């Protein structure tokens, strides 16, 4: 019937090609009349964009394509914005990981002080995107799968409460995929689940096949021995220890950072972090492939391939486009879904997705263990956004001090000072 | 593939035959190995059951059939209980309607002091059915479409919080059916809606076709001129009157029962204290169905009675099948609020959209509701909770408070006069009130 207009914010992402490839393999369920790229780093995006221009011309030359650094040109005439930006890129991620480690605190992209720092950089970036979208395409939907979703979602809830923004996380997708393999189902869409939490901080409470057969027993018996490692890395295996605290549920893998922070630090190397691995491998590999493709005018000159994993974004996009009522986990204002939890908290819960966005299902009352953990972590997140809004040093020191990943307020302060000096070019002045 | 065992509580209901004919026409989606009727009025059930037995022998002789007044015989080996009991029957309903009218207050089956009286009689009966079910078939589900659901659901929420009871109402089904004809769709299942309220006291907030097209603009235009009367005497007046009820909040569509709360003066004005709805049903439906059943028995053939399939009732099979086959079908059910309507009492029973599967309902959130509806619902839910307070605590003042608080009642003095009459008339059903 109709073809859609999509703009990818963060066109310079090393995941942009795989995603474009995935979109092309899904023109049957989600056809496009136009595809545009947007980035604030022109030179970086150009390499990714010229390579994709070749791919698109090969598999779908009928699709109108363009890339730019100009918001008006990028956000004009679009139905959807796919946002995957990394304010500060990998050089800043390296700082997020190493600074906490100098003080004996885990350094990670979205958890602990590292995540807090990334969130402080990301809030402004994402608010700008929202403002461009509303100005040039007031009816468009933004599919934000950027990080740290918990902090950024709190900011958009607070400062852009009526903006058509959908915050989604792919971590649960990956864990459900492994759970499916473990119990022997062909994919995660063969399961129906109940879940609650914050982004990167939740639990499955009910896991059944489509017929209603309870899969929890089978998963409990297996996960207790091997974690989320299917019969076919460390994070998935460690889920074994996370799940033992509450035998009746299945935990999100990111909970290892909050329940076993001593372990993460113990297995961390302050000299080489994950950002270093990506910069040494993925960053060069993808750009080298794009350079090769441009030089040849053929995609085959590159080893890029489809990111079937990212198909959940099309699930979301199509749910809205064709009002499918598909059931999926989204980050939404709680407002009674979890009855005994803060109404103004952003929570990750099951929702039906239609053309008007999500219809969250009720969750009910949650127990003291999860409630206590979530209350602590959402306060951290809300303090980070307080610090950004109010340009308050004490609000951020409070946030860091409150984190379960941080042993004391003195260590929290030492880290905060180091973080301030490193993020001078991104954070507002803190008083 | 799997066959179900059902018992109908209220076998002597004039709706039982039409419902049985409905079950028979749906053996494809809901196969039965067994069907049983239960009633506490043997002689009345016997006429209905013996007539239905002739129908089952003609259409489904494989289905095991029996009727009884024995709870053990009735509630043993069942998967579902379909409960449609009317404690006190029509003679008591006549009292519910006429006592308030004698004092210038509307008399109605489930709304106003009549509804309150019927609820006081029903709580005990339903608590008994639930206890029998749990004792003789612990794993069975009760499909309760009896009335007055708002009072009874509040009672079971407090006193049988963990029993497997699904509270459902058929009024929204009928109104949606009419809405569909009005917009021109094939049927109500071609629409997806959002709704909130108490039983017999709610509003549709969103009405779309399955593709998401807005049907509210066309409905507003039509309803503002003719109410819910489709293009195509009692109910016909109520559907037309929705015109006036809907005008208070143009952005929504109301449940027809709201006419009793927003236009109670109108209802009293168009009421006859000497002949009420109960008298109409008694002189028509009660006579006709029993005479038809009596004709089928005497002739030994279904064609001897003018019994028609109750296609409307099919919603009961939608519910039963959703549970039995984990279909995730979306429908309105009466469930504990507990945050679904965020700015409304968590312990209130609310009528809202739910997904229904084998574990029962999964309610959808509603969000915050506006002052108008919140005000009306807070008033009415307090009435309902006061009734159950009166029942539980055996308190006269609690029921006087309940009746006084009703938007159908003008004052505490009128409320007290009505209460004293209802007490005398319900001598054999109500618990004592100190
Ligand atoms: N499937 C995916 O795309 C995927 C996978 C994992 C994580 N993520 C998350 O999505 C985000 C993107 O990470 P990545 O590794 O996919 O991309 P990346 O780190 O390879 O590149 C990020 C791009 O965003 C651009 N950018 C930064 N700030 C911007 C702004 N204000 N406006 C416009 N563009 C801006 C940068 O110039 C850069 O080209 C991260 O937060 C990450 O946690 C996405
Ligand atoms: N059956 C339907 O589809 C339908 C339609 C509209 C309304 N209702 C509602 O359902 C209820 C039944 O109404 P009706 O007109 O269908 O029935 P009815 O008045 O025709 O018959 C009611 C039956 O329930 C029996 N009964 C009363 N108390 C009982 C008890 N404690 N245990 C067992 N049986 C008992 C009576 O003896 C009688 O046989 C009412 O509350 C009514 O508002 C049902
Ligand atoms: Cl707030
Ligand atoms: Cl390599
Ligand atoms: Cl909605
Ligand atoms: Cl600021
Ligand atoms: Cl909807």
Numbering used by the authors:
A (entry chain B): 1 to 232, 242 to 440
B (entry chain A): 1 to 232, 239 to 440
Question: Which passages does the manuscript contain on this structure?
Answer:
Here, we report the deposition of 14 structures of enzymes from both the core and accessory genomes of sequence type 23 (ST23) K1 hypervirulent K. pneumoniae. Targets were selected using a shotgun approach aimed at uncharacterized metabolic proteins from ST23 K1 hypervirulent K. pneumoniae. In silico multilocus sequence typing of all K. pneumoniae isolates was completed using Kleborate. This analysis showed that 64 of the selected proteins are part of the K. pneumoniae core genome, defined as genes present in at least 95% of all strains; the other 132 proteins are part of the K. pneumoniae accessory genome and are overrepresented in the highly virulent hvKp clonal group CG23, which contains ST23 (7). Thus, the x-ray crystal structures presented here provide the basis for functional analysis of 12 uncharacterized proteins associated with high-risk K. pneumoniae infection.
Of these targets, 34 were successfully purified from large-scale preparations and entered crystallization trials. Fourteen structures were determined for 13 different targets as detailed in Fig. 1.
